[PDB]
């Protein structure tokens, strides 16, 4: 998860690759769902908030450059 | 005819992308989603360059309004307030939400042009005297005066709403009294529209942004109030016919049936979490 | 017979990767939901309530998984979870099965139906109702 | 626990068997990249509850087993 | 051409939230149905980069006509 998360500022401005990353991450999330851990959606809320920040940050950076 | 402008206030779906689609779409997630109208110039189309603007949300889109409202844009500024019928309670207040945003924008962008203060207020005193004649005294109107208009959308859901919870002429009369009331105060008019209905829109804009039409408050399943088709008594009889006469809390009535419906998908649980050392010594105290 | 049973592990693993991939496909397709399943639309054209078609979907998926499980144990012998992989596939099929016990849908939906039943289901009270 | 004995596995080019000090028999894998054995023998009486100094595979492809012989005095295929 | 520059400056106004895009999330799914995918990322998120990257060009398209 974290290699994807920490790699969210690596593949510069490619929506396909972004999509791919997210899909992989939630594949791991269904793995988490099956052998259900305790409060999984709560931790996902956390994730998503920081993902939004890395996203919007890469966005605004590319926004200025564009 | 020069560069014309329009400032519609896109409100969370409410068929706004569909409003310009029914009028004439990439995506709607950014706001300020410009559109340009260049329609028939009363005999042909002389490119009636009526630039549209559609904001949605509230996150500091003031500077975007600067990019949509200049100092010379001011005359040809047909602001259009758009709201749905799926959530009429939103409309009731959210109209004033958008309104107050523009009230700020009046005293934030028109504060340097002081010529239309002493000019446009008198021109509005001219203008709103013309709001009423040749259509078909005094009303507690507002400070906002420039070409303004309040429209509604999502109206072909009437039977769906009475199917859910309206089924009362109070619910239908009270909203229209507040709407027509809003518009007459605001120096505007009240217009409705629906899914595959009511091409009465361009009539008033083309008619105003320079073709006239006779009004309707008759059907009451779809309403068209041009400016000056008001008083403060016809509507008073309308919210009198068993409608709880002028209730100043029933905002919660229609702002209670589907907004204070419930929350289906809600996960505020704070489910569980425990300790280690704590449990261990607590069991030590439990060892006796 | 252990004598026989010894020389088949290679073929066993070939079959396990087959079973593996198909249960993985079940995770995929079931991870897409019934409302967005196109099967819901076709089933709806075949005229079922969405409640029924949803649990039919669920229950059928369950039957495919159970058929796979019996395929697994017939291939891997009855000592099957004791085997290195069988324990894993057991756990996975069990949790996947726990994410398929749809009686709650009938519960909550029966409550909504009961809520509607309070004054709608027997509305013959005005055979020719005024309007 | 302390591995008291270890060796490879017969016709398992990815596995490593192992004896311990506790008595459990472990089983590591290289291709999984799990620095912990994936199949640990229980500590039941049916298993070894004493260190196994000599645990070994025996025959060929179909002639094999795994015989663990702890110091307790038990053999277990 | 000054109006075209005004459109370029309109795109320059995208720094409104000052390198944050705090509200950058736009979609919401339906209610509860039957799902093992209990915690998908965000119905509002996945499409937002392509959405922004496209709407940037979209405004430029509408100004051109």
From Swiss-Prot, chain A:
It is found in: Cytoplasm, Cytoskeleton. Homodimer. The cytoplasmic dynein 1 complex consists of two catalytic heavy chains (HCs) and a number of non-catalytic subunits presented by intermediate chains (ICs), light intermediate chains (LICs) and light chains (LCs); the composition seems to vary in respect to the IC, LIC and LC composition. The heavy chain homodimer serves as a scaffold for the probable homodimeric assembly of the respective non-catalytic subunits. The ICs and LICs bind directly to the HC dimer and dynein LCs assemble on the IC dimer. Interacts with DYNC1LI1; DYNC1LI1 and DYNC1LI2 bind mutually exclusive to DYNC1H1. Dynein heavy chains probably consist of an N-terminal stem (which binds cargo and interacts with other dynein components), and the head or motor domain. The motor contains six tandemly-linked AAA domains in the head, which form a ring. A stalk-like structure (formed by two of the coiled coil domains) protrudes between AAA 4 and AAA 5 and terminates in a microtubule-binding site. A seventh domain may also contribute to this ring; it is not clear whether the N-terminus or the C-terminus forms this extra domain. Belongs to the dynein heavy chain family. This is Cytoplasmic dynein 1 heavy chain 1. The gene is DYNC1H1.
UniProtKB/Swiss-Prot annotation, chain B:
The chain holds residues 52 to 373 of 492 of the full protein. It comes from Homo sapiens (Human). Acts as one of several non-catalytic accessory components of the cytoplasmic dynein 1 complex that are thought to be involved in linking dynein to cargos and to adapter proteins that regulate dynein function. Cytoplasmic dynein 1 acts as a motor for the intracellular retrograde motility of vesicles and organelles along microtubules. May play a role in binding dynein to membranous organelles or chromosomes. The keyword Phosphoprotein applies. This is Cytoplasmic dynein 1 light intermediate chain 2. Keywords: ATP-binding, Cytoplasm, Cytoskeleton, Dynein, Methylation, Microtubule, Motor protein, Nucleotide-binding, Phosphoprotein, Transport. Disulfide bonds: none annotated. Belongs to the dynein light intermediate chain family. The gene is DYNC1LI2. ATP binds at residues 10-17. One of its GO terms (cellular component) is microtubule. GO terms for molecular function: ATP binding; dynein heavy chain binding; identical protein binding.
UniProtKB/Swiss-Prot annotation, chain C:
Cytoplasmic dynein 1 acts as a motor for the intracellular retrograde motility of vesicles and organelles along microtubules. Dynein has ATPase activity; the force-producing power stroke is thought to occur on release of ADP. Plays a role in mitotic spindle assembly and metaphase plate congression. It is found in: Cytoplasm, Cytoskeleton. Belongs to the dynein heavy chain family. Dynein heavy chains probably consist of an N-terminal stem (which binds cargo and interacts with other dynein components), and the head or motor domain. The motor contains six tandemly-linked AAA domains in the head, which form a ring. A stalk-like structure (formed by two of the coiled coil domains) protrudes between AAA 4 and AAA 5 and terminates in a microtubule-binding site. A seventh domain may also contribute to this ring; it is not clear whether the N-terminus or the C-terminus forms this extra domain. This is Cytoplasmic dynein 1 heavy chain 1.
Swiss-Prot record, chain D:
Pyrophosphorylation by 5-diphosphoinositol pentakisphosphate (5-IP7) promotes interaction with DCTN1. Serine pyrophosphorylation is achieved by Mg(2+)-dependent, but enzyme independent transfer of a beta-phosphate from a inositol pyrophosphate to a pre-phosphorylated serine residue. It is found in: Cytoplasm, Cytoskeleton; Cytoplasm. WD repeats lie at residues 1-38, 47-77. It comes from the Eukaryota. Belongs to the dynein intermediate chain family. It is linked to Neurodevelopmental disorder with microcephaly and structural brain anomalies: An autosomal recessive neurodevelopmental disorder characterized by global developmental delay, severe intellectual disability, microcephaly, dysmorphic facial features, and cerebral malformations including simplification of cerebral gyration, agenesis of the corpus callosum, and brainstem and white matter hypoplasia. This is Cytoplasmic dynein 1 intermediate chain 2. The lineage of its organism: Eukaryota, Metazoa, Chordata, Craniata, Vertebrata. The chain holds residues 333 to 409 of 638 of the full protein.
